[PDB]
Design a binder for this molecule. Structure first.
Ligand SMILES: CNCc1c[nH]c2ccc(F)cc12
Ligand SMILES: CNCc1c[nH]c2ccc(F)cc12
Lengths: 304, 304
């Protein structure tokens, strides 16, 4: 028993982190096979970031200008190319620690682990979610760019995020490993405001199921609701609309606990309308939305 | 910017996890050098756990009864001994992945990362604290015993916890790597109730400093207090008494923010007396106490 915000074990990803320096900028790179992936803004000076023309800046860079260091040993760069907002630096050595991997572009509401790195060295690992406004609420200081987000399924690492920037509001924006930003964000130091940060309703319901499984049941009530009735309340509280796909995904949790999805929606509806009255659920005084139904099943079953 | 409950990168510890089976019980072991450490209750059947005589049960076990598997390869056990509540299984092969390590016995209030494992395979990593009642609030299912807690200082892993049991209240108890339980707990399936779970005051103050650094400042007030005045309020709310040692440890955070420790205590005093009024601090509606002052400095400075 017990339910924690758990990250995937990070070892497989730690073996892929390298330091990339171009001119006076140093950030992190991800070394998989004979390619090092890093944010293209490694070629920028803080001044260039105001209005960078990446194709123009890249013409002034050659293979020898990209310094790639794995631990204390230098990698030889034999090619470089820009794909969207990432640079792909071809090196002469395949990473011996390359795990089985995929590049995936996640949907908002999905969770992943971030291995925060500085100078190619891992500092910590935490779990987060792609917010519905395509930002993430991470913990990233200067030098953390190029740190990656990932999920692990047995022995295959699915990389989904690479860190690029912090908006002036302290939230984070990045790309998938193809270099495409999540959301409308651009790698320029300009006014970029995030949209509404709505709550991931299906994740809140999954976490309420996790609470019931782990013994926290005070919030269960005698009511039920419909998808349309629940959604009138979800809209009012800036919660994402719940669809039948979300109800289907919650099926296994509904079956395990014996609590119908719409009954759990009615509990959530009363929590939204009345608050927690100074009570807590799974050690939280807020309705937690960074656990997917898959995360709840995995943690409650012990998937390794 | 941003502040997350961050765990240490777990790779160094993942390379130490093995599966230990004795009879029909399978749990995790920690392989460092040529020794595998695991809870001594690996020799028990669920029935033995009611009133186990470990010395008597161990006489019926020989080296060949301890099956140790690292990945898919078997380790040869050439010796075994019991030290307090852990068994030390001497194997014929030193773990090639043994990192630089120490065994430390932590104090209540200190934090560490747990690599939850099942069948010797890592499932996830999370951060927690040794509670003042010597329990931890983890996420452990059956098969997780032998999972370890640790801290990392550059390249040295300090192991501080090994998981042994879950109390009937869903909280967790374990030992240091010398096999001595934290608190009064025993490895027997009997009535063991935890004492008061007080709040780690110095950690709450550290987290309020982290909030100020990261932009959450609404709770700062025009007041100050004294250690004795603050402690009258801390006692009332089941908070640990704050000492001058705690004030000294908060010195660097006080210096960085320019907010005197006793002024932050006065903010905390008003938060205890008035609540948050539906507001949040660092994405929490509760006063977070599982970040030490060292954790705040580390995360706010980017230690790798
Ligand atoms: C969601 N609107 C009411 C509200 C504000 N804050 C909250 C925290 C928890 C909860 F269950 C409800 C609330
Ligand atoms: C600590 N006693 C009041 C109280 C109950 N619950 C709380 C949650 C947050 C906070 F700042 C204060 C409170």
């Amino acid at each position: 028993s017990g339910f924690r915000k758990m990250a995937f074990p990070s070892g497989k990803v730690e073996g892929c982190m390298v330091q990339v320096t171009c001119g006076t900028t140093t950030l992190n790179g991800l070394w998989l096979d004979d390619v090092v992936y890093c944010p293209r803004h490694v070629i920028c000076t803080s001044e260039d970031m105001l209005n960078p023309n990446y194709e123009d800046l890249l013409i002034r860079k050659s293979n020898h200008n990209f310094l790639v260091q794995a631990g204390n040993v230098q990698l030889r760069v034999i090619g470089h190319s820009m794909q969207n907002c990432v640079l792909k630096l071809k090196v002469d050595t395949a990473n011996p620690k390359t795990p089985k991997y995929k590049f995936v572009r996640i949907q908002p509401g999905q969770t992943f682990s971030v291995l925060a790195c500085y100078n190619g060295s891992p500092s910590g690992v935490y779990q987060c979610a792609m917010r519905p406004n395509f930002t993430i609420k991470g913990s990233f200081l200067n030098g953390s760019c190029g740190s990656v987000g990932f999920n692990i399924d047995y022995d295959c690492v699915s990389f989904c995020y690479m860190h690029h920037m912090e908006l002036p509001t302290g939230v984070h924006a990045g790309t998938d490993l193809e270099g495409n930003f999540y959301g409308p964000f651009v790698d320029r130091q300009t006014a970029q405001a995030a949209g509404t940060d709505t709550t991931i309703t299906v994740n809140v319901l999954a976490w309420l199921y996790a609470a019931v499984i782990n013994g926290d049941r005070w919030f269960l009530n005698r009511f039920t609701t419909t998808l349309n009735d629940f959604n009138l309340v979800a809209m009012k509280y800036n919660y994402e609309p719940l669809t039948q796909d979300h109800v289907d995904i919650l099926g296994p949790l509904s079956a395990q606990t014996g609590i119908a999805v719409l009954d759990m929606c009615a509990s959530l509806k009363e929590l939204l309308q009345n608050g927690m009255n100074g009570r807590t659920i799974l050690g939280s005084a807020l309705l937690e939305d960074e656990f997917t139904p898959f995360d709840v099943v995995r943690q409650c079953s012990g998937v390794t």
